[PDB]
């Protein structure tokens, strides 16, 4: 084992995943909220007071979640696998510590219960933190479950990682028809939601805002901030020796039109036309209302006295509005990935909790003074009694906002809905990729396919091959394998550190020199106006690589303008890459060997300075190398591992680079629907609907991805023996034919299980529900419905059910809404039945039945059914490389061909897909499989590499077969050889969802709607399908005039109406009721949907006066 840094750089990627797994985006954000962010909320809501009894105060000192301070034990907690079986919330209580004025003396009390907040599993606060497969075996939980999701009141949901544009920054924009605008939103953390627009009306620059009644030309608002000399402005906006002075020259003369000319007169021009907010005092000075008008705007910076920096921040904003008017090439998209701030849940539920807590400590405050407006109830009164009534608003506000994924915010007044989603346990990887997925904001640019497409600045940031299709085509995307999000730390020390590094100050520099030099932009704000950044920025990296400053900083530095950029806002995308200094890297394979000893982890490399995190903005400036054989003496930041651009749901495809790129996007949506095994406790859990596979098989041509997620420890699907050939004509377009023997051997026998539940309900008249059953008839208890109903009324475990055959009896009192009579007169027989009947066209079994109680004392019943089935023809299969397949026919083993050894192929597929679909991956997998089969050794098919071909054919020919594996075989139906050679071997085939046994539906004549009397839409609603308008026009294109009448009212909507002749409207059964003689009545028929039509227009003043003729006597 001669180790080297040429091909063993892969081995440090598991050292990343071991100490730092895949649920960074959910665990660490939730943990940092619980560890740190709980204190930073309560400190800004402290010291509740009352106006009545002014010497009373309550203040809380600190808050804690979980354990007390007296016991100081870990906890005693319900198990979550137990908690999901009782439809309860898996939550943890919050303890607060308070002091207040009881009376004569003030008193401090500890550990006060205010609510129970939910906790996601595998956090450090839950009991599943760092188990050893025995405590978790005692808690019967699968250790291969990643976790990261709530178990509120039964169902398991998860917060999706939302995003928006980069807040608190400006963007450039161009539009031809309506002028060009400059959007700049700012959202400070206290109620502020402000966005500013810099518009261009016919060559004149303005600023409109939704707190100002009109627009203002900028020549006023620069003098209002102090900068008035009017030669400073063009020196700041335009510079010297350009055409910018010519374009900007329109805006100068308007200060002469308004005749202001000074700093003092510049203010009150705004406050004249300001949209004045009602402060209920209205002190307004006509000097300070304009001073605050230069404070509540552009909320990045607020100035105490000078307004100097805020002025130049406007000058930076209005500089690029003319550069965009100079040429439309300088504008940018809002689709570039650097203009996006992805944001996690733990700092997002911080917004949700602070809304509830400010709603908590004022409703309780409304209770206090209502007691304190009493003479007697002001001395001995204690307020700790009134806590628990108001405490319920938190927990119900928690669980409702997580079950119903809609959030009613108040300080921002915004209704982001659909934020929570029930996770799918269809496959093992189906729950993996939902943890790593991105949901956009759909900013109503539905016409433009720009954001629908994929940006080239995504290589290694997040995954590019997993993106759905259909209604969600490009607005949902998925995480890559090596990815970290940043977090903010502070801007205070770095602005002190750059002064030490030799940058100037904004309040000292001449305005001519800033356009000559560059400028340090701290989150878009100029403070120093740096010169010669190449000395400046490289001395900063040596502070970061050695680790004097934090590593989540980006030193993006453009050259289209004269500027450099600093970003520490946090919540932006990045990935780590190893530093390359010069024509030699910093590989140091002896340290890579010292990793595999086990003391030198991934963390110490960035501690020493062998690796650092890079965002997309640092990837502007950097020059990442492909390989160690590609090093230039001008070449930095070697790419650590090339196949890390695909996630674990994109990683399991063997040899993706040989396959076509749309054939990789098809499988990731369908790999989530492949059935198999789910968890270790899957026979213990009781969930709504489960597909299970009897015999899975770990695939032959493996990948480095699947062994990093242990996908082979629980596979889904199995390997066939594929003979790609035309046979019997039943496979023409991607169909499949398999052998009748191997299904009897047990190839592909799945299992279907389905939960159903009932709740025994308690009524206000103290009447329960009873499970009496097995009414008897002719010496035997069981009716044809009652053979499987058990002695207790609960259906007996151990036997099948068929259609009909009540399996849960239930009887309900008939006085379900009557008032309780305070006596005992007549309650002996009131139970009418509401039994539960097994539907379905196929006989199934129960799996097992449980009973329990809810969080409140109310009885719970949960039974789960069980049936297996064999995949007969019609069932949908796939190929892991994007080849769907429906079973064409199921023929005998004697009908299938056979080799010299008699090996019968499991399935056959037509050859007519591989040239069209351009899928090379199956063609190599069979070669990589069969030679690996005969060698017994499982092989690695990875991206950008994997097992090669020329070494694999040498093993395949030493066994004595074809070097290309395209063998010859005999015939099954006539015996002799076949004139061609047959490409034969084993290929891993998964079974999908969407089987035919639960998709056969047909309705002949059944239920109808109430308002339309139409057949009811819905397969569970007993169907009747919509023959729509696009199909309606094709019938007239045939010219058929009677089944058009028949299939539109006779088969659907026939209804007989008697109508009056003169003043002709309908009447009822035999009457006219508009000329009440009931004589001139015509029996005919119309659509019922036409009958309601001229009844609803009659509701308003419209008279459909009907006129008749006879059919005959032309």
């Amino acid at each position: 084992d001669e180790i080297n840094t040429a091909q063993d750089k892969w081995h440090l990627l598991p050292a990343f995943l071991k100490v730092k797994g895949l649920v960074k985006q959910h665990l660490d954000s939730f943990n940092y909220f619980v560890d740190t962010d709980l204190k930073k909320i309560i400190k800004a809501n402290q010291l509740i007071l009352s106006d009545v009894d002014p010497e009373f105060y309550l203040k809380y000192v600190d808050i804690r979640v979980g354990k007390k301070s007296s016991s100081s034990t870990k906890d005693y907690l319900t198990p979550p696998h137990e908690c999901r079986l009782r439809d309860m919330t898996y939550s943890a209580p919050i303890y607060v510590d308070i002091e207040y004025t009881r009376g004569r003396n003030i008193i401090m009390h500890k550990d006060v219960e205010i609510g129970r907040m939910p906790i996601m599993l595998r956090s450090n606060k839950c009991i599943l933190y760092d188990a050893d497969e025995s405590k978790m075996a005692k808690l019967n939980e699968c250790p291969l479950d990643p976790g990261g999701y709530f178990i509120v009141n039964g169902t398991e949901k998860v917060i999706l990682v939302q995003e928006q544009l980069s807040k608190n920054r400006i963007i450039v924009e161009a539009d031809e028809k309506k002028g060009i605008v400059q959007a700049s939103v700012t959202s400070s953390t206290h109620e502020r939601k402000s966005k500013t627009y810099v518009i261009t009306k016919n060559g004149k620059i303005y600023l409109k805002h939704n707190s100002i009644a009109e627009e203002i030309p900028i020549a006023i608002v620069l003098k209002a901030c102090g900068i008035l000399s009017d030669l400073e402005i063009m020196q700041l906006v335009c510079g010297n020796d350009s055409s910018y002075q010519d374009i900007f020259a329109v805006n100068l003369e308007e200060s002469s039109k308004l005749d202001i000319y000074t700093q003092q007169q510049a203010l009150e021009y705004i406050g004249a036309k300001v949209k004045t907010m009602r402060r209920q005092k209205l002190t307004i000075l006509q000097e300070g209302i304009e001073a605050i008008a230069t404070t509540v705007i552009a909320h990045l910076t607020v100035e105490a006295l000078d307004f100097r920096e805020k002025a130049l921040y406007i000058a930076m904003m209005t500089r690029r509005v003319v550069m965009a008017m100079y040429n439309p090439k300088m504008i940018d998209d809002r689709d570039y990935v650097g203009n996006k701030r992805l944001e996690l849940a733990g700092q997002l539920i911080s917004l949700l909790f602070e809304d509830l807590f400010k709603k908590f400590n004022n409703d309780f405050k409304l209770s206090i003074d209502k007691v304190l407006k009493k003479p007697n109830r002001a001395m001995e009164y204690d307020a700790l009694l009134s806590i628990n009534v108001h405490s319920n608003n938190i927990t119900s506000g928690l669980n409702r906002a997580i079950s119903t994924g809609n959030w009613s915010l108040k300080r921002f007044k915004m209704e982001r809905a659909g934020v929570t989603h029930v996770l799918s346990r269809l496959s093992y990887i189906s729950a993996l990729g939902m943890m790593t997925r991105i949901s956009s904001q759909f900013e109503k640019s539905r016409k433009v396919s720009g954001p629908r497409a994929l940006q080239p600045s995504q290589f290694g940031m997040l995954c590019t091959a997993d993106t759905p299709e259909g209604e969600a085509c490009g607005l949902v995307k998925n995480l890559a394998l090596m990815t970290h999000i940043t977090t903010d730390d502070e801007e205070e020390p770095i602005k002190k550190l750059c002064y030490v590094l030799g940058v100037e100050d904004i309040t000292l520099i001449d305005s001519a020199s800033l356009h000559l030099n560059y400028g340090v932009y701290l989150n878009g704000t100029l403070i120093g106006s740096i010169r010669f950044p190449t000395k400046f920025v490289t001395q900063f990296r040596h502070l970061r690589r050695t680790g004097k400053v934090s590593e989540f900083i980006s030193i993006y530095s453009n050259s289209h303008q004269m500027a450099v950029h600093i970003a520490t806002d946090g919540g932006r995308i990045c990935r780590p890459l190893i530093i390359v200094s010069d024509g030699q890297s910093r590989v140091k394979d002896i340290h890579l060997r010292k990793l595999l000893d086990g003391e030198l982890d991934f963390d110490d490399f960035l501690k020493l300075g062998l690796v650092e995190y890079l965002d997309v903005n640092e990837e502007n400036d950097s020059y990442i190398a492909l390989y160690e054989k590609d090093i230039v003496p001008s070449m930095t930041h070697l790419e650590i591992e090339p196949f890390t651009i695909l996630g674990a749901v994109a990683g399991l495809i063997p040899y993706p680079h040989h396959n076509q790129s749309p054939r990789n996007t098809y499988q990731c949506a369908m790999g989530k629907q492949a059935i198999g095994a789910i968890a270790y406790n899957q026979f213990k859990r009781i969930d709504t609907l489960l597909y299970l596979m009897t015999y899975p098989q770990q695939p032959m041509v493996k990948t480095k991805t699947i062994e990093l997620i242990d996908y082979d420890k629980l596979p889904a699907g199995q390997n066939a023996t594929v003979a790609v050939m035309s046979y019997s004509g039943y496979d023409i377009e991607d169909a499949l034919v398999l052998n009748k023997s191997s299904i009897d051997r047990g190839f592909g026998r799945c299992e279907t299980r389905r939960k159903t539940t009932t709740v025994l309900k308690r009524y206000a008249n103290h009447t329960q529900d009873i499970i009496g059953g097995m009414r008897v008839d002719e010496n035997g208890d069981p009716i044809w419905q009652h053979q499987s109903l058990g002695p207790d009324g609960l259906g007996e475990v151990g036997m099948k059910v068929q259609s009909g055959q009540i399996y849960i009896n239930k009887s309900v009192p008939t006085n379900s809404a009557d008032a309780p009579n305070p006596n005992n007169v007549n309650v002996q027989t009131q139970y009418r039945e509401a039994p539960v009947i097994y539907r379905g066209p196929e006989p199934s079994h129960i799996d097992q039945v449980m009973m329990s109680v809810s969080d409140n004392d109310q009885a719970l019943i949960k039974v789960l059914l069980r049936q297996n089935r064999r995949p007969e023809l019609g069932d949908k299969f796939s190929s892991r490389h994007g080849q769907k397949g429906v079973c064409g026919i199921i023929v005998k083993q004697e009908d299938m061909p056979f080799n010299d050894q008699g090996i019968v192929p499991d399935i056959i597929m037509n050859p007519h897909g591989f040239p069209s679909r351009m899928t090379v991956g199956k063609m190599i997998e069979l070669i990589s499989g069969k030679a690996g089969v005969l060698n017994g050794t499982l092989e690695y098919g990875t991206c950008f590499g994997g097992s090669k071909l020329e070494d694999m054919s040498k093993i395949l020919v030493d066994q004595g077969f074809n070097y290309s594996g395209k063998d010859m075989l005999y015939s099954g139906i006539t015996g002799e050889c076949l004139q061609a050679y047959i490409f034969f071997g084993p290929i891993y085939y998964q079974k999908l969802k969407h089987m035919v046994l639960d998709k056969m539906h047909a309705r002949a004549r059944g239920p109808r709607a109430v308002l339309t009397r139409q057949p009811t839409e819905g397969r569970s609603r007993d169907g009747g399908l919509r023959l729509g308008e696009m199909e309606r026009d094709c019938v007239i294109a045939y010219g058929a005039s009677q089944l058009l009448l028949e299939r539109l009212m006779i088969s659907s909507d026939a209804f007989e109406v008697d109508v009056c002749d003169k003043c002709g409207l309908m009447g009822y059964s035999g009457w006219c009721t508009t000329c009440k003689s009931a004589e001139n009545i015509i029996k005919m028929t119309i659509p019922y949907a036409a009958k309601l039509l001229f009844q609803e227009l009659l509701s308003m003043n419209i008279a459909p006066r009907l006129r008749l003729e006879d059919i005959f006597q032309q």
Binding site: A817, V1010, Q1095, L1098, S1099, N1101, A1103
Partner: protein, 48 residues
């Protein structure tokens, strides 16, 4: 046009209003409770 009974322009603003049958506005029972979820057609007419 003349010669018709409703040919006055006086009947082109609401003085009377007819009530439609309850088949058009069905009292649907959602079975979330023993109370019926009564539709918006009746309660707008009730405020009238």
């Amino acid at each position: 046009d003349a010669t018709v009974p409703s040919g006055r322009p006086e009947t082109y603003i609401w003085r009377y209003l007819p009530a439609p049958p309850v088949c058009i506005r069905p009292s649907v029972m959602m079975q979330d409770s023993p109370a019926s979820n009564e539709d918006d057609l009746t309660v707008k007419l009730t405020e009238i």
